[PDB]
Design an enzyme around this catalytic site. Structure first.
Site, PDB file in Angstrom:
ATOM      1  N   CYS A 127       0.818  -1.226   0.000  1.00 34.45           N
ATOM      2  CA  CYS A 127       0.000   0.000   0.000  1.00 34.45           C
ATOM      3  C   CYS A 127       0.836   1.253   0.000  1.00 34.45           C
ATOM      4  O   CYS A 127       1.586   1.510   0.945  1.00 34.45           O
ATOM      5  CB  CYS A 127      -0.970   0.030   1.203  1.00 34.45           C
ATOM      6  SG  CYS A 127      -1.958   1.551   1.287  1.00 34.45           S
TER       7      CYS A 127
ATOM      8  N   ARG B  12       0.050   4.659   2.830  1.00 32.51           N
ATOM      9  CA  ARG B  12       0.132   4.426   4.266  1.00 32.51           C
ATOM     10  C   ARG B  12       0.504   5.660   5.090  1.00 32.51           C
ATOM     11  O   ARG B  12       0.424   5.631   6.302  1.00 32.51           O
ATOM     12  CB  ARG B  12       1.077   3.267   4.554  1.00 32.51           C
ATOM     13  CG  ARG B  12       0.450   1.927   4.309  1.00 32.51           C
ATOM     14  CD  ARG B  12       1.473   0.836   4.580  1.00 32.51           C
ATOM     15  NE  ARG B  12       2.470   0.759   3.515  1.00 32.51           N
ATOM     16  CZ  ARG B  12       3.602   0.069   3.619  1.00 32.51           C
ATOM     17  NH1 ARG B  12       3.883  -0.560   4.766  1.00 32.51           N
ATOM     18  NH2 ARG B  12       4.449  -0.011   2.585  1.00 32.51           N
TER      19      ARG B  12
ATOM     20  N   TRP C  73      -9.224   6.428  -0.635  1.00 28.66           N
ATOM     21  CA  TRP C  73      -9.581   7.169  -1.847  1.00 28.66           C
ATOM     22  C   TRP C  73      -8.623   6.749  -2.957  1.00 28.66           C
ATOM     23  O   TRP C  73      -7.568   6.185  -2.678  1.00 28.66           O
ATOM     24  CB  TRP C  73      -9.524   8.676  -1.637  1.00 28.66           C
ATOM     25  CG  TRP C  73      -8.257   9.217  -1.022  1.00 28.66           C
ATOM     26  CD1 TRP C  73      -7.062   9.487  -1.670  1.00 28.66           C
ATOM     27  CD2 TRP C  73      -8.055   9.575   0.346  1.00 28.66           C
ATOM     28  NE1 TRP C  73      -6.144   9.978  -0.772  1.00 28.66           N
ATOM     29  CE2 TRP C  73      -6.725  10.038   0.470  1.00 28.66           C
ATOM     30  CE3 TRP C  73      -8.873   9.548   1.488  1.00 28.66           C
ATOM     31  CZ2 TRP C  73      -6.199  10.483   1.690  1.00 28.66           C
ATOM     32  CZ3 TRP C  73      -8.360   9.993   2.691  1.00 28.66           C
ATOM     33  CH2 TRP C  73      -7.031  10.469   2.783  1.00 28.66           C
TER      34      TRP C  73
ATOM     35  N   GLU D 237      -4.904   3.818 -10.696  1.00 30.64           N
ATOM     36  CA  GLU D 237      -5.712   2.623 -10.449  1.00 30.64           C
ATOM     37  C   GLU D 237      -6.859   2.553 -11.469  1.00 30.64           C
ATOM     38  O   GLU D 237      -7.088   1.487 -12.091  1.00 30.64           O
ATOM     39  CB  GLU D 237      -6.284   2.597  -9.028  1.00 30.64           C
ATOM     40  CG  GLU D 237      -5.229   2.550  -7.933  1.00 30.64           C
ATOM     41  CD  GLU D 237      -5.861   2.598  -6.542  1.00 30.64           C
ATOM     42  OE1 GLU D 237      -6.340   1.538  -6.109  1.00 30.64           O
ATOM     43  OE2 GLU D 237      -5.854   3.661  -5.871  1.00 30.64           O
TER      44      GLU D 237
HETATM   45  C1  HEM Z   1      -6.261   6.607   1.841  1.00 35.35           C
HETATM   46  C2  HEM Z   1      -5.973   6.416   0.543  1.00 35.35           C
HETATM   47  C3  HEM Z   1      -5.298   5.116   0.045  1.00 35.35           C
HETATM   48  C4  HEM Z   1      -4.640   5.031  -1.116  1.00 35.35           C
HETATM   49  C5  HEM Z   1      -4.389   6.198  -2.110  1.00 35.35           C
HETATM   50  C6  HEM Z   1      -4.167   3.668  -1.267  1.00 35.35           C
HETATM   51  C7  HEM Z   1      -3.429   3.178  -2.336  1.00 35.35           C
HETATM   52  C8  HEM Z   1      -3.265   1.845  -2.632  1.00 35.35           C
HETATM   53  C9  HEM Z   1      -2.946   1.280  -3.925  1.00 35.35           C
HETATM   54  C10 HEM Z   1      -2.735   2.139  -5.208  1.00 35.35           C
HETATM   55  C11 HEM Z   1      -2.831  -0.052  -3.767  1.00 35.35           C
HETATM   56  C12 HEM Z   1      -2.524  -1.153  -4.836  1.00 35.35           C
HETATM   57  C13 HEM Z   1      -3.913  -1.496  -5.434  1.00 35.35           C
HETATM   58  C14 HEM Z   1      -3.846  -2.450  -6.592  1.00 35.35           C
HETATM   59  O1  HEM Z   1      -3.019  -2.208  -7.506  1.00 35.35           O
HETATM   60  O2  HEM Z   1      -4.592  -3.477  -6.614  1.00 35.35           O
HETATM   61  C15 HEM Z   1      -3.110  -0.368  -2.378  1.00 35.35           C
HETATM   62  C16 HEM Z   1      -3.087  -1.637  -1.830  1.00 35.35           C
HETATM   63  C17 HEM Z   1      -3.501  -1.953  -0.552  1.00 35.35           C
HETATM   64  N1  HEM Z   1      -3.906  -1.052   0.430  1.00 35.35           N
HETATM   65 FE1  HEM Z   1      -4.102   0.987   0.197  1.00 35.35          FE
HETATM   66  N2  HEM Z   1      -4.549   2.941  -0.150  1.00 35.35           N
HETATM   67  C18 HEM Z   1      -5.300   3.787   0.662  1.00 35.35           C
HETATM   68  C19 HEM Z   1      -5.952   3.413   1.834  1.00 35.35           C
HETATM   69  C20 HEM Z   1      -5.955   2.147   2.385  1.00 35.35           C
HETATM   70  C21 HEM Z   1      -6.688   1.737   3.560  1.00 35.35           C
HETATM   71  C22 HEM Z   1      -7.684   2.654   4.333  1.00 35.35           C
HETATM   72  C23 HEM Z   1      -6.347   0.475   3.820  1.00 35.35           C
HETATM   73  C24 HEM Z   1      -6.873  -0.429   4.968  1.00 35.35           C
HETATM   74  C25 HEM Z   1      -7.169   0.119   6.186  1.00 35.35           C
HETATM   75  C26 HEM Z   1      -5.403   0.037   2.807  1.00 35.35           C
HETATM   76  C27 HEM Z   1      -4.772  -1.205   2.722  1.00 35.35           C
HETATM   77  C28 HEM Z   1      -4.255  -1.752   1.573  1.00 35.35           C
HETATM   78  C29 HEM Z   1      -3.970  -3.164   1.392  1.00 35.35           C
HETATM   79  C30 HEM Z   1      -4.171  -4.340   2.393  1.00 35.35           C
HETATM   80  C31 HEM Z   1      -3.460  -3.285   0.010  1.00 35.35           C
HETATM   81  C32 HEM Z   1      -3.057  -4.639  -0.648  1.00 35.35           C
HETATM   82  C33 HEM Z   1      -4.267  -4.985  -1.513  1.00 35.35           C
HETATM   83  C34 HEM Z   1      -3.979  -6.206  -2.330  1.00 35.35           C
HETATM   84  O3  HEM Z   1      -2.919  -6.882  -2.117  1.00 35.35           O
HETATM   85  O4  HEM Z   1      -4.835  -6.500  -3.185  1.00 35.35           O
HETATM   86  N3  HEM Z   1      -5.149   1.097   1.972  1.00 35.35           N
HETATM   87  N4  HEM Z   1      -3.306   0.820  -1.687  1.00 35.35           N
HETATM   88  N1  LIG Z   2      -6.680   3.832  -3.352  1.00 38.29           N
HETATM   89  C1  LIG Z   2      -7.041   2.658  -2.755  1.00 38.29           C
HETATM   90  C2  LIG Z   2      -7.579   2.654  -1.460  1.00 38.29           C
HETATM   91  C3  LIG Z   2      -7.940   1.430  -0.883  1.00 38.29           C
HETATM   92  C4  LIG Z   2      -7.741   0.257  -1.623  1.00 38.29           C
HETATM   93  C5  LIG Z   2      -7.209   0.294  -2.922  1.00 38.29           C
HETATM   94  C6  LIG Z   2      -7.024  -0.985  -3.753  1.00 38.29           C
HETATM   95  C7  LIG Z   2      -8.201  -1.240  -4.753  1.00 38.29           C
HETATM   96  C8  LIG Z   2      -8.500  -0.132  -5.777  1.00 38.29           C
HETATM   97  N2  LIG Z   2      -7.924  -0.562  -7.058  1.00 38.29           N
HETATM   98  C9  LIG Z   2      -7.552  -1.971  -7.029  1.00 38.29           C
HETATM   99  C10 LIG Z   2      -8.022  -2.474  -5.637  1.00 38.29           C
HETATM  100  O1  LIG Z   2      -7.124  -3.389  -4.999  1.00 38.29           O
HETATM  101  C11 LIG Z   2      -7.725  -4.659  -4.740  1.00 38.29           C
HETATM  102  C12 LIG Z   2      -7.386  -5.583  -5.896  1.00 38.29           C
HETATM  103  N3  LIG Z   2      -5.958  -5.868  -5.932  1.00 38.29           N
HETATM  104  C13 LIG Z   2      -5.496  -7.040  -6.652  1.00 38.29           C
HETATM  105  C14 LIG Z   2      -5.834  -8.294  -5.860  1.00 38.29           C
HETATM  106  C15 LIG Z   2      -5.103  -9.489  -6.412  1.00 38.29           C
HETATM  107  C16 LIG Z   2      -5.490 -10.094  -7.607  1.00 38.29           C
HETATM  108  C17 LIG Z   2      -4.793 -11.214  -8.081  1.00 38.29           C
HETATM  109  C18 LIG Z   2      -3.710 -11.716  -7.346  1.00 38.29           C
HETATM  110  C19 LIG Z   2      -3.325 -11.082  -6.156  1.00 38.29           C
HETATM  111  F1  LIG Z   2      -2.274 -11.526  -5.432  1.00 38.29           F
HETATM  112  C20 LIG Z   2      -4.024  -9.978  -5.688  1.00 38.29           C
HETATM  113  N4  LIG Z   2      -6.871   1.497  -3.448  1.00 38.29           N
END
Ligand code: HEM
Ligand SMILES: Nc1cccc(C[C@H]2CNC[C@H]2OCCNCCc2cccc(F)c2)n1
Ligand code: HEM
Ligand SMILES: Nc1cccc(C[C@H]2CNC[C@H]2OCCNCCc2cccc(F)c2)n1
Ligand SMILES: C[C@H](O)[C@H](O)[C@H]1CNc2nc(N)[nH]c(=O)c2N1
Ligand SMILES: C[C@H](O)[C@H](O)[C@H]1CNc2nc(N)[nH]c(=O)c2N1
Ligand SMILES: [Zn+2]
Lengths: 411, 407
Positions: A108, A111, A280, A285
Site C-alpha cells: 500500500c 500508508r 480514496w 488505479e
Molecule cells: C487513503 C488512501 C489510500 C490510497 C491512495 C491507497 C493506495 C493503494 C494502492 C494504489 C494499492 C494497490 C492497489 C492495486 O493495484 O490493486 C493499495 C493496496 C492496498 N492497500 Fe491501500 N490505499 C489507501 C488506503 C488504504 C486503507 C484505508 C487500507 C486499509 C485500512 C489500505 C490497505 C491496503 C492493502 C491491504 C493493500 C493490498 C491490496 C492487495 O494486495 O490486493 N489502503 N493501496
Molecule cells: N486507493 C485505494 C484505497 C484502498 C484500496 C485500494 C485498492 C483497490 C483499488 N484498485 C484496485 C483495488 O485493490 C484490490 C485488488 N488488488 C489485486 C488483488 C489481487 C489479484 C490477483 C492476485 C493477487 F495476489 C491480488 N486502493
C-alpha cells in the site's frame, strides 16, 4: 542486526531493524526470489503466543508495558483462551489492530494516512441484513459527499471456520461484467464470474457497461444474500478531458469509493474474514489499470483513434500517448466534481516521506516495490529509485480464497 | 520444488524446474525479500569446471562420451598442475552466450544465441586492448545496423594482473561540476571524468563529450585513448511533430556497450569483457534524459511544450516524458541506427520466456529490471510473474577499479 536501503537518486541511506520482528515467511529463499509472484481453525496452542505478542505490542504502544493493566490483560486473555478456545478484543485493541494492519501493508502506497482510519465495530452483527446495514453506513460515512474519509468495518471473527462472515464482492462497489455468446464482454471483464453468481442468486441484471453490482453477503456461515446498495449512496464521476471535448462521448464513468472487501484481517491470532475497508483513489488505479489493462475495459485503441495518433507502429508510442491523456481525464474529472483523488506523483512523494519517518520512528517500513511503483511513468516517481525491504508484520491484511470456492451450500 | 509462474493477462501458467540447477545466493531469505536492492583455490575451481563442462557436453549431445571424460581428466590435470585452466574456443563461445542467456536483468535475451565472440585472450598491453576495442566498436556498429558482440580479455590469474576497462560503458559522455553548483554533461560520470583529467585527458568541457577509454592491461596503470570519432555513431535528437526539439541540443550515441562487468565461465573470471547490443528507446529517453540525477531535461522540455507546470496532477511530467521518448525512437529510426521500443522488446521477451520454459525448463528474470521505466502495465511483462535466480555462466558486478587498483 541491521539492513541498509539506499535511494539511488538522493543517496539517502536508511537502516532497518524492524525486520527482526518479522516471523511469517516471504516465499523467497537464499536460492530464489519470488518478489514478483502475486500469491506466493487455530489451536489454543498456537493462539496464546499470538495473543501475547500482540498485547505486548499494544501495551508498548500506549507506554504501559509491564504495567499491572498489561499483566492483568495477559492473564484475562490466557484464562479466556483456555476456557473458550478463543478471546475477544477490547475496542481499543481492535482499533489499534486495524490501524496497524494498514501500517504493515507492504503493497500500500497510501500508508502515510494509516493513523487516520475510522473503525466501525460490527462484531455484534448476526445476519446478512445486519451486514448490509453496516456496509451502507460505511459507504455513506466514507463517501462524505466526495470528501472521502478512510474507514473499515469489522464483522465477527472466525470461530470454527464453519460460521464465517464474508463479503462475496471483491470490492463494495464494482461494475458488472457479461460474457456475450459471441465471446465479447460487456462491462468489466474482471467481474464476469462474480456477475454470473449474482444472476444465479436472483439479481436482475440491467446488462449495461457500468452496472453497480449488488452486495452478496454471508453472515455466520449461512448462504449469502443479495442486496442493492441505494443508488443515492454510490457516488460516481463521469469522465471528461480538460481539452478534448469528444472524451465525454466515450461514455466513461467510475465510482469514487475504492473499498476492498475480500481480505482477511489478522489481529493477535484472531481472524476477521469480513473486514471491508476504503480509502480514496490514486488516479492510475482507474486510468491505467481499470481502463487500459487488456483484460479490463481496454480503451486504449478507441482513445488513440479519436486522438488521430499514428497507430500502425508501436514505436509511434500511441499507446503511451493515449495512456497519459486518459489519466489526465481521470484526475481532472474527480477534481472538478470535488471527489478526493491523488495523482501518482503526489502519492509516491508522500510515500517516501512516510517511509523515511517510519525508519526514523519505527526502525523500518516493509514495502513491496513491485506494487508501490505506479503502473505508468515508473522512474519519474521517486519510489522507483528507492530500495525497499519486504517482510511480513502482524497485525496484517491477508488474501483468502474466494468464498464460492469453499462455501458449503445449505440450500 | 517445481514452481509455477502465471501471466495474469493471459492466464498462461509455466512450470519452472531450471531454478533447481541454481547455486549462488539471491540475497533474499524466508523472512525478508531483497528483490529491489540493486546490489544484494584449486579446491573450489574443479567443481566449477566440472559443472560447466558437464553442461557444455550435454548441450552438444555428448554427455558421458569418451570425448567428455577425456576433457574432464585433461582439465583436472591442468588445474592440479597450474592452479587454473584454459577454455577451448568452443567452450568460451558457449560460455559467453550462456552468461547472456542467464542475465536475469536483460530484456533483450531473445537474441542470446546471435552473439559474436571476439577472443582477445592473446592481448598483453593497453594499446592492444585499445585495438581490440576499436575493432569491436566498428564491427558492432556496422554503419548503424548493429550487431551484438563481446570481446574477452585474458582471465584473472593471481588477481594483481587484472585486465580492466575503467569506463562503465565503451561510449559515454563526460560530466563536469562548476562554481555554479550545477553539473554540465552527464552527472553520472563526474568522478570518472575527473580521473581522466588527473591522468592527462584535456577535456572540451562541453555537454556531450565522448569520454576517452582508460585501459588497464596486466594490472598496470591505465592509459588514455580517444576512440576515432568516425567509429562513434551518434544520433541528433529531433521530434517528428515539434520542430523546436532540435534546439535543445540533444544527441545520444548509437552503441550501448557495457564494459565494467565480470564474466564467469567454469570458475574462471574475465574481469574485462566489454559487450554490446542495441538500445531499447526508454534507456535513453526515460533514464539517461529524465532521471533527476542524469541529464534531467523534463523541466526544459515541458516549458517548450508550454504545459501547466504548477501542479503535478496535470501530468506535465508524464506528457513531456512520452514526447522525449517519441523523439528518441524517431531520430534513431530516421538515421537508420538499430533501436527497439519498449513494446516490441517486452513482447519479444515474453516469446523468449515461453521458448526457454518449453526448451530449458525456465528463464531467470528480475521483474524489477525487466519492466520498462515508463508505461509499465501497458507492456506484457508487467503482468508476467517471473522467478529470479542465479545461474552460471554469468555476468557479475565487480568493484570500481579506482577503489581497488594498487598504483
Ligand atoms: C487513503 C488512501 C489510500 C490510497 C491512495 C491507497 C493506495 C493503494 C494502492 C494504489 C494499492 C494497490 C492497489 C492495486 O493495484 O490493486 C493499495 C493496496 C492496498 N492497500 Fe491501500 N490505499 C489507501 C488506503 C488504504 C486503507 C484505508 C487500507 C486499509 C485500512 C489500505 C490497505 C491496503 C492493502 C491491504 C493493500 C493490498 C491490496 C492487495 O494486495 O490486493 N489502503 N493501496
Ligand atoms: N486507493 C485505494 C484505497 C484502498 C484500496 C485500494 C485498492 C483497490 C483499488 N484498485 C484496485 C483495488 O485493490 C484490490 C485488488 N488488488 C489485486 C488483488 C489481487 C489479484 C490477483 C492476485 C493477487 F495476489 C491480488 N486502493
Ligand atoms: C541486443 C539488444 C539488447 C537489448 C535490447 C538489451 C536490453 C537490456 C536492458 C534495457 C537492460 C537494463 C539496462 C539498465 O537498465 O541499466 C539490460 C541489462 C543487461 N544486459 Fe542486455 N540487452 C541487449 C543485449 C545484451 C548483450 C549482447 C549482452 C551480453 C552479451 C547483455 C547482457 C546484459 C546484462 C549482463 C545486463 C545487466 C546489466 C546491469 O546489471 O547493469 N545484453 N539489457
Ligand atoms: N540495450 C542495451 C544493451 C546492452 C546493455 C545495456 C545496458 C546499458 C545501456 N543503458 C544502461 C547500461 O547498463 C549498464 C548500467 N546498468 C546499471 C548499473 C548499476 C549502477 C548502480 C547500481 C547497480 F546495481 C547497477 N543496454
Ligand atoms: C506479475 C506481477 O507481480 C503483477 O502483475 C503485479 C505487478 N505490480 C502490481 N502493482 C499493483 N499496485 N497492483 C497490481 O495488481 C500489480 N500486479
Ligand atoms: C531501487 C531499484 O531497485 C532501482 O531503482 C532499479 C529499479 N529498476 C531498474 N530497472 C532497470 N532496467 N535499470 C535500473 O537501473 C533500475 N533501477
Ligand atoms: Zn525476494
Amino acid at each position: 542486526r541491521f539492513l541498509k536501503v539506499k535511494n539511488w537518486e538522493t543517496d539517502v541511506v536508511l537502516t532497518d531493524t524492524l525486520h527482526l520482528k518479522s516471523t511469517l515467511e516471504t516465499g523467497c529463499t537464499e536460492h530464489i526470489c519470488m518478489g514478483s509472484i502475486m500469491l506466493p481453525v487455530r489451536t489454543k496452542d498456537q493462539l496464546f503466543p499470538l495473543a501475547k505478542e500482540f498485547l505486548d505490542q499494544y501495551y508498548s504502544s500506549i507506554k504501559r508495558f509491564g504495567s499491572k493493566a498489561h499483566m492483568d490483560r495477559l492473564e484475562e486473555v490466557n484464562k479466556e483462551i483456555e476456557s473458550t478456545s478463543t478471546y475477544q478484543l477490547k475496542d481499543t485493541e481492535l482499533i489499534y489492530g486495524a490501524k496497524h494492519a494498514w501500517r504493515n501493508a507492504s503493497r500500500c502506497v497510501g500508508r502515510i494516512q494509516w493513523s487516520k482510519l475510522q473503525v466501525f465495530d460490527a462484531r455484534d452483527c448476526t445476519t446478512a441484513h445486519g451486514m448490509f446495514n453496516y456496509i451502507c453506513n460505511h459507504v455513506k460515512y466514507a463517501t462524505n459527499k466526495g470528501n472521502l474519509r478512510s474507514a473499515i468495518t469489522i464483522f465477527p471473527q472466525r470461530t470454527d471456520g464453519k460460521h464465517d462472515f464474508r463479503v462475496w464482492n471483491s470490492q463494495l462497489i464494482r461494475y458488472a461484467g457479461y460474457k456475450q455468446p459471441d465471446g465479447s464482454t460487456l462491462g468489466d471483464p474482471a467481474n464476469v464470474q462474480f456477475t454470473e453468481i449474482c444472476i444465479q442468486q436472483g439479481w436482475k441484471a440491467p446488462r449495461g457497461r457500468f452496472d453497480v453490482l449488488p452486495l452478496l453477503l454471508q453472515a455466520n456461515g449461512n448462504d449469502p444474500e443479495l442486496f442493492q446498495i441505494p443508488p443515492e449512496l454510490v457516488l460516481e464521476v463521469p469522465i471528461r478531458h480538460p481539452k478534448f471535448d469528444w472524451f465525454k462521448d466515450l461514455g466513461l464513468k467510475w465510482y469514487g469509493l475504492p473499498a476492498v472487501s475480500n481480505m482477511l484481517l489478522e489481529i493477535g491470532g484472531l481472524e476477521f474474514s469480513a473486514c471491508p475497508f476504503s480509502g480514496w483513489y490514486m488516479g492510475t488505479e482507474i486510468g491505467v489499470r481499470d481502463y487500459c489493462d487488456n483484460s479490463r475495459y481496454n480503451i486504449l485503441e478507441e482513445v488513440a483513434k479519436k486522438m488521430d495518433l499514428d497507430m500502425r507502429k508501436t514505436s509511434s508510442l500511441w499507446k503511451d500517448q493515449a495512456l497519459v491523456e486518459i489519466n489526465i481525464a481521470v484526475l481532472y474529472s474527480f477534481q472538478s466534481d470535488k471527489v478526493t483523488i491523488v495523482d501518482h506523483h503526489s502519492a509516491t512523494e508522500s510515500f517516501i516521506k512516510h517511509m523515511e519517518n517510519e525508519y526514523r520512528c519505527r526502525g523500518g517500513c516493509p514495502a513491496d516495490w513491485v506494487w508501490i511503483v505506479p503502473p505508468m511513468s515508473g522512474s519519474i516517481t521517486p519510489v522507483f529509485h528507492q530500495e525497499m525491504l519486504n517482510y511480513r508484520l502482524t497485525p496484517s491484511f491477508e488474501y483468502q480464497p474466494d468464498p464460492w470456492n469453499t462455501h458449503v451450500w445449505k440450500g
